[PDB]
Amino acid sequence: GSHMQVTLKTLQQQTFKIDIDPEETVKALKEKIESEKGKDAFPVAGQKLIYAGKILNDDTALKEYKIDEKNFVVVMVTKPKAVST
């Protein structure tokens, strides 16, 4: 409807269920899980997403990856590694 739901796996051996507007970008789907699992474990500036082999984008809308309520997506984290050089 006005929102759509997705199943999410993580690098921490768990799975969950969430819902967002399917015409928003990955940025919306990625920000909303930090509200549940925290900056200390899933920092927005340093987390990433995969749809079973596809490389998702914070600047492309969720329906263009054709994600489905009966399939799942995987989240990953790098902190980020941003340091002075």
From Swiss-Prot:
Listed result of changing residue 9 to A: Impairs interaction with EEF1A1
Span of domain Ubiquitin-like: 4-82
Subcellular location: Nucleus; Cytoplasm
Function: Multiubiquitin chain receptor involved in modulation of proteasomal degradation. Binds to polyubiquitin chains. Proposed to be capable to bind simultaneously to the 26S proteasome and to polyubiquitinated substrates and to deliver ubiquitinated proteins to the proteasome. May play a role in endoplasmic reticulum-associated degradation (ERAD) of misfolded glycoproteins by association with PNGase and delivering deglycosylated proteins to the proteasome. Involved in global genome nucleotide excision repair (GG-NER) by acting as component of the XPC complex. Cooperatively with CETN2 appears to stabilize XPC. May protect XPC from proteasomal degradation.
SUBUNIT field: Component of the XPC complex composed of XPC, RAD23B and CETN2. Interacts with NGLY1 and PSMC1. Interacts with ATXN3. Interacts with PSMD4 and PSMC5. Interacts with AMFR. Interacts with VCP; the interaction is indirect and mediated by NGLY1.
Domain characteristics, as noted in the entry: The ubiquitin-like domain mediates interaction with ATXN3.
Family: Belongs to the RAD23 family.
Full protein name: UV excision repair protein RAD23 homolog B
Full-length numbering of the shown residues: 1 to 82 of 409
